[PDB]
Amino acid sequence: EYQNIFTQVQVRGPADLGMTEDVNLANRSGVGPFSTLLGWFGNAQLGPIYLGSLGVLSLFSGLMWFFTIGIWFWYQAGWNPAVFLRDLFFFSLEPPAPEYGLSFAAPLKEGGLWLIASFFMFVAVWSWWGRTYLRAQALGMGKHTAWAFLSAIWLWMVLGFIRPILMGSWSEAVPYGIFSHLDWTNNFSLVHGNLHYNPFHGLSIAFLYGSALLFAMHGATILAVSRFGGERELEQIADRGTAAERAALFWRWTMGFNATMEGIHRWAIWMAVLVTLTGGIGILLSGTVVDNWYVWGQNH
């Protein structure tokens, strides 16, 4: 039987320049090439892309953050390319030491460069958030994407900005490095008495696992009713078809209740944002209110 995981026959037509609405067409690129590779799994068309002031600012600010970390890695490598590749994952740009507190007066080689990199990352992320809002606004769509994005920004802001400030030291922030930021994750737990016993950490996991649970359910469900065009969900919301009915009835007969075509995407957006929403809270409280989650757990 055909499973509909990979397209059997690809079809290609004139490129789709996309809806206009109130989008400033001056800032849209030309269409890119078609990818027969991607055509087997999804759409083959690449581009066009929208590049405005926020996009340019975010892209440029982002590359500076990347380049700031870069020159530091080359400096740790002694400017030797061989050493650069050998120890690439071990290089790390650390925040200032605790002795500098929240001051920006740390010299470049003792966390001053980390502060610069963090600035470029701050401008890149937030300008990109403003991008996801204005792109939705230009097309007249809701701002669900932007609000869903904030939940990720919330954990990111806590990890390296809000929580360090409340602790009173940039040294509480995370370092820029592949392995180093893993070690920072490991020590953060040990210092704070086992994050397994941070309830907002357990909730965060329930929603991470729950995200993989729900999307496997939903992805499998839509492919199972794609033989009825189930993936055309907007028109199934406006005019319920046998796809939506069979999908709902499968889960009703299975676990006792079911969703609608629209309602399942509210389960989805909430299951996913709650991951970084609960997570940001758990980290914010660690060290500011609770020094030992295991001990704190025994009194409750």
């Binding site: 890119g32 892309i49 929208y50 120890d87 792109r135 097309l139 055309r232 676990m255």
Partner: protein
Amino acid sequence: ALLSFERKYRVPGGTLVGGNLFDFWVGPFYVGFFGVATFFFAALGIILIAWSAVLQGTWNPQLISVYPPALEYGLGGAPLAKGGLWQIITICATGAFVSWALREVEICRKLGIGYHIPFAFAFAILAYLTLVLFRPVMMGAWGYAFPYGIWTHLDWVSNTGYTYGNFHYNPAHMIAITFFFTNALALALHGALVLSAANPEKGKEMRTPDHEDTFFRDLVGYSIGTLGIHRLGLLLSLSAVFFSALCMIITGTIWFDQWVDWWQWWVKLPWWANIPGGIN
């Protein structure tokens, strides 16, 4: 009770076993043979959990913990109070999970839809058996499996992880995490996109899928498509669980040192392994 559109679908047929003996519903739930099987394994499993609670001396659900047999018992049987209950409960759980999957298949047949859902559920089952069966057997003792307790099974994760230093450095463990993160990223984006189209700005008419394509092309220059994202989410979630079972079946079986040592084959290559400077 039925949904307004449900009756026309409640036809006979589609079973795999028992013909029309168990081909009926209890409220919303469809029974079928494997529904009876599920109820049987479940009820027996819970009884043995309650029984273990009596032997343990507590009925607080946050303290109940059914432990597997001690390492000295190897892969043989153990008395009920010394790990036999964990063994029987594990059999029951496995029977219930499988029966649940075969029940889903009967429901797929009666609705004339694909079998993607139970197929995806089997990945979860695989990961469970990886921790409670495949890995213990390959290591030669049931004691290596994890205990059935709300909190004692988290300690097992912590004990098992730290036996190999920082488990983060397990390369398969990285890949699995990446799929879990990327999955929640894709799930949030998908749900937000459909809702943003079906619920536009005030004073706007419902959007079309073309708006969804156009939004994501304007944003990152590529749209995967209405069909491709559901394929994608199915593959991100299953791949996440696949490499999760992979990163554990190899731990303690073909890899015994700390996982950070696994990354020395890159550091220590005889050409650049000696060049002075750098971290190493």
